[PDB]
Design an enzyme around this catalytic site. Structure first.
Site, mmCIF file in Angstrom:
data_model
loop_
_atom_site.group_PDB
_atom_site.id
_atom_site.type_symbol
_atom_site.label_atom_id
_atom_site.label_comp_id
_atom_site.label_asym_id
_atom_site.label_seq_id
_atom_site.Cartn_x
_atom_site.Cartn_y
_atom_site.Cartn_z
ATOM 1 N N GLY C 67 0.851 -1.269 -0.034
ATOM 2 C CA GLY C 67 -0.066 -0.237 -0.030
ATOM 3 C C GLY C 67 0.792 1.256 0.079
ATOM 4 O O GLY C 67 2.031 1.230 0.339
ATOM 5 N N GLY C 116 0.491 -4.607 0.954
ATOM 6 C CA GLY C 116 -0.914 -4.318 0.255
ATOM 7 C C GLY C 116 -1.121 -5.483 -0.877
ATOM 8 O O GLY C 116 -2.188 -6.098 -0.845
ATOM 9 N N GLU C 139 6.367 -4.551 7.746
ATOM 10 C CA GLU C 139 5.576 -3.220 8.592
ATOM 11 C C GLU C 139 6.299 -2.802 9.616
ATOM 12 O O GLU C 139 6.324 -1.827 10.358
ATOM 13 C CB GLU C 139 4.338 -3.718 8.799
ATOM 14 C CG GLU C 139 3.578 -3.767 7.452
ATOM 15 C CD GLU C 139 3.258 -5.173 6.989
ATOM 16 O OE1 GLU C 139 3.570 -6.054 7.812
ATOM 17 O OE2 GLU C 139 3.562 -5.319 5.626
ATOM 18 N N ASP C 147 -1.436 -5.425 8.558
ATOM 19 C CA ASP C 147 -2.476 -4.929 8.229
ATOM 20 C C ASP C 147 -3.119 -5.821 6.886
ATOM 21 O O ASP C 147 -2.639 -7.031 6.696
ATOM 22 C CB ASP C 147 -2.478 -3.506 7.660
ATOM 23 C CG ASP C 147 -1.677 -3.346 6.473
ATOM 24 O OD1 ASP C 147 -0.609 -3.782 6.404
ATOM 25 O OD2 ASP C 147 -2.030 -2.846 5.442
#
Lengths: 237, 114, 467, 65
Positions: C67, C116, C139, C147
């Site tokens: 992302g 993502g 992350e 996520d």
């Protein structure tokens, strides 16, 4: 021949028999074919690269990409006739696979004609098992032959030890001569050493040839005599 | 890739040759690569070529030009007899010598501009 | 005038979605997510689309590098928190739509699939990997959390050393990159297909259609998709050796085995007090080094989510990620460093790790607040055409390599059968390779079964016992 | 029909004596690896999942007309 329709649609024609009731019982293949559909496009597919040499197929060099003069000293300012002909056919014609090694292979056997006389086995064992380190010419599993030289030459040019293909080829050739000379001596000496310890051999290669030539020369003697007697009678006429 | 494998295949190793399989001129050296099949493969007409060799062939040595042709046959001759000439030369144990006393071509000699 | 960020095309009855941001490694922004989310709802209503194919136009360079969080960092620095919450509502809503999508989705993970990108594939039962696949969840180095529902997927799909989410915690907390065949053997990828064969596979996917009176949403069609992909699978490279050895798998299974109220310190204790082989001991030190270069707050939040989204339903796990993301961009209690760390690494190129300041041990209440919805900020996931929730993926198990818990169940069942027979490793391999219809001849299935029996089973006489 | 202990081996006994040697001794000295045996294609075919391009190429399947 026309693209057939009825071979790939057996499932759909069968399904009409079952739905109407013309066929009472579902065939055993019916479920298997339904879950695994046949391919039914039968189309011609374009190709944009030669897999052997990576040459791009279907690329046109525009005049903007040729700003400099040519070998004749003239600039290119307009497309030529070849550039203006559609080249769709090249997209569909099976590409001619080419290899640099093919050129060296022809050279090697032109320089060493008698290497052809060494029988070669074309039957493969398992291509996937070949674990060869071409830092050296000899390899466990394969014979020493012209291919050993070619693969050694490619390894040299691939490792950039030599720049010119000729120099790498010459280097490999000498390694090949050394291995060929050590084997010619091991065989001569082995025969000599065996005879010195009382080894006996029925027929030698030279003897084998004499016997075969005698068999042929015996039939030839009969025919010559027969045909030198029919001539005498026929000529007497 | 498949192209890389093909270039190294045993068939690729045989250099292209279209010289007449039936030559009636003067023969000084081998012109075609001898192909050999094992007895087990011969029993199954397998020679590592494109198509099965006819069962009539009982020799285990042949020479060929084309894998396939417009006549739907292989162009081959079931003979491997140039190997026996080389082996008979070896049995005579006569080394080949230069009548001009030139350097041995199989040794990397330091030559000069003589 | 500009090239659209995501390109949509028709492939016979298959609809191909292609990520088209090559310069950004196909990073996912709000625009891309919104476009894909809207177009997928239309395809769900359509009766001419049988399956969807999510790929990239940059393969083999990358499928999705993650992302677009660098842009979210600038928003935080500019107090554009509404923009940031829009980026996560779109992305997380798209990940929820893919997870609950009723038609087969086939993701081609041909390249870097990190962040993502993992959300685009982890939620699909048909996630195909290639030699160029590079799966990672980096992350912890940026100050964010795992996520895109990775805290609900990884604890449920990993195959080895994942009885208590030990391997899931290892990947999420260390950010280790898994490559190609290793991703397939761990369960990150359902299938392993050579990149060269992707073109042919795409064409075959467009040509297959549900037979007779079966819709594309039926289980029957899902089996057909699985079989089609299998025809293009090829045997693994001869030299290939699994990335993690049994000894390395024993370190993860023990050092990352926490309780329902575990803490990152407990993992640090195990990695610092581990005993065993020299390789295992050295391996535990390597993990300890890595885990000490991460964000002290992110590691605790990640562990919290893994221990919370490993027993909850999909909708509550994805919703809890939206709350956490919003509660992190808006750092009300100055407990995280997501924004500052993101600028240190992405907005500004700095190889060195960001010097961390929030090095305390958040309490259970502090973690609860960071992972619970604030009554002042109302955020909800966009509505999809399925609007369903469940605690177990409906198709992931059937079409991936079996987990260590499924092999154990068959050994226990077989060992407790009235037959009174002995469970033998050979019988286990046969039962998983030549019996289950959906797993028949599955690549690298016998190798995985032998890794499990050699490390989990005890061979006594001609029988096997589950140590 | 066994021969007398003083008489030499019969033709049939020599065949059985050779068969005994064939089972035990005849295969001493080395094992053979990575060699193609034509019969094994029929009696030991591989499973479809283990087939590679190399294996197909080794059999000559790529050689068209």
């Amino acid at each position: 021949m026309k693209i057939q329709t009825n071979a790939v649609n057996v499932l759909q024609r069968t399904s009409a028999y079952l739905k109407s009731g013309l066929l009472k019982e579902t065939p055993a293949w019916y479920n298997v074919v339904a879950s695994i559909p046949p391919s039914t496009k039968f189309t011609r597919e374009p190709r944009f690269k030669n897999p052997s040499n990576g040459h791009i197929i279907g690329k046109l060099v525009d005049v903007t990409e040729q700003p400099h003069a040519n070998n004749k000293g003239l600039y290119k300012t307009r497309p030529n006739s070849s550039d203006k002909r559609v080249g769709v056919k090249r997209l569909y014609r099976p590409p001619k696979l080419t290899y640099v090694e093919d050129r060296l292979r022809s050279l090697f056997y032109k320089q060493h004609p008698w290497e052809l006389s060494r029988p070669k086995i074309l039957v493969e064992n398992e291509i996937g098992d070949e674990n060869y380190d071409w830092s050296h010419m000899l390899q466990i599993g394969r014979p020493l032959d012209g291919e050993s030289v070619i693969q050694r030459t490619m390894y040299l040019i691939k490792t950039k030890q030599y720049g010119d293909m000729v120099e790498a080829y010459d280097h490999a050739r000498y390694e090949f001569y050394a291995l060929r000379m050590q084997e010619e001596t091991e065989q001569q000496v082995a025969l000599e050493e065996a005879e010195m310890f009382g080894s006996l051999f029925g027929v030698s290669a030279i003897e084998h040839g004499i016997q075969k030539e005698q068999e042929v020369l015996d039939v030839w003697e009969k025919k010559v005599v027969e045909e030198t007697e029919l001539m005498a009678a026929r000529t007497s006429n | 890739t498949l192209a890389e494998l093909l270039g190294r295949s045993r068939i690729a190793q045989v250099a292209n040759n279209h010289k007449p399989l039936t030559y009636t001129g003067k023969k000084f050296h081998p012109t075609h690569q001898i192909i050999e099949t094992k007895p087990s493969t011969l029993y199954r007409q397998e020679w590592g070529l494109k198509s099965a060799i006819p069962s009539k062939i009982k020799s285990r040595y042949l020479v060929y030009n084309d894998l396939d042709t417009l006549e739907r046959i292989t162009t081959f001759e079931p003979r491997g007899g140039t190997q026996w000439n080389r082996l008979r030369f070896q049995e005579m144990g006569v080394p080949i010598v230069s009548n001009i006393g030139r350097q041995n071509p199989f040794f990397k000699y330091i030559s000069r501009p003589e | 005038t500009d090239a659209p960020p995501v390109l949509f095309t028709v492939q016979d009855t298959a609809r191909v979605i292609t990520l088209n941001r090559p310069k950004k490694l196909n990073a996912l922004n709000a625009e891309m997510s919104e476009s894909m989310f809207k177009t997928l709802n239309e395809y769900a209503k359509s009766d001419t689309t049988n399956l969807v194919i999510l790929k990239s136009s940059n393969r083999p360079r990358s499928f999705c590098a993650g992302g677009d969080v660098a842009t979210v960092a600038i928003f935080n620095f500019n107090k554009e928190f509404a923009k940031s919450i829009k980026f996560f509502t779109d992305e997380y809503s798209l990940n929820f739509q893919i997870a609950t999508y009723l038609k087969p989705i086939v993701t081609f993970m041909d390249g870097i699939t990190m962040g993502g990108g993992v959300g685009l594939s982890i939620h699909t039962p048909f996630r195909i990997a290639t030699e160029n696949t590079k799966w990672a969840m980096p992350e912890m180095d940026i100050g964010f959390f795992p996520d895109v529902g990775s805290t609900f997927a990884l604890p449920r799909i990993v195959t080895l050393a994942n009885s208590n989410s030990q391997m899931a915690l290892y990947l999420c907390l260390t950010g280790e990159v898994v490559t190609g065949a290793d991703a397939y053997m761990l369960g990150l990828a359902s299938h392993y297909v050579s990149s060269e064969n992707l073109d042919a596979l795409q064409k075959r996917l467009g040509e297959i259609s549900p037979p007779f009176n079966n819709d594309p949403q039926s289980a029957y069609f899902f089996g057909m998709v699985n079989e089609s992909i299998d025809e293009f699978v090829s045997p693994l490279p001869k030299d290939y050796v699994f990335k993690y050895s049994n000894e390395k798998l024993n370190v993860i299974e023990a050092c990352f085995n926490l309780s329902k109220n575990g803490t990152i310190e407990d993992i640090m204790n195990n990695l610092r007090q581990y005993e065993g082989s020299a390789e295992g001991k050295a391996f535990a030190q390597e993990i300890k080094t890595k885990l000490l270069t991460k964000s002290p707050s992110s590691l605790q939040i990640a562990l919290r989510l893994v221990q919370e989204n490993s027993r909850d339903h999909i909708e509550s796990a994805i919703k809890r990620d939206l709350y956490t993301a919003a509660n992190m961009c808006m750092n009300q209690d100055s407990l995280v460093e997501f924004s500052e760390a993101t600028k240190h690494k992405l907005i500004d190129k700095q190889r060195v790790p960001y010097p961390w300041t929030k090095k305390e041990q958040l309490f259970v209440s502090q973690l609860t607040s960071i992972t619970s919805p604030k009554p002042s900020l109302p955020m909800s996931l966009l509505r999809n055409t399925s609007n369903v929730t469940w605690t177990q993926y409906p198709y992931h198990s059937k079409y991936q390599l079996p987990t260590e818990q499924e092999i154990a169940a068959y050994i226990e069942k077989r060992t407790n059968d009235d037959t009174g027979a002995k469970v033998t490793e050979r019988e286990v391999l046969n039962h998983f390779a030549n019996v289950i219809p959906s797993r028949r001849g599955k690549l690298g299935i016998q190798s995985l079964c032998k890794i499990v029996c050699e490390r989990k089973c005890e061979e006594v006489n001609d029988g096997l016992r589950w140590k | 029909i066994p021969s007398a202990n003083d008489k030499p081996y019969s033709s049939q006994e020599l065949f059985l004596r050779q068969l005994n040697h064939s089972m035990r001794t005849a295969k001493l000295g080395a094992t053979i690896s990575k060699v193609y045996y034509p019969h094994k294609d029929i009696f030991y075919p591989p499973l479809p999942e283990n087939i590679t391009v190399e294996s197909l190429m080794s059999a000559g399947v790529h050689l068209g007309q």
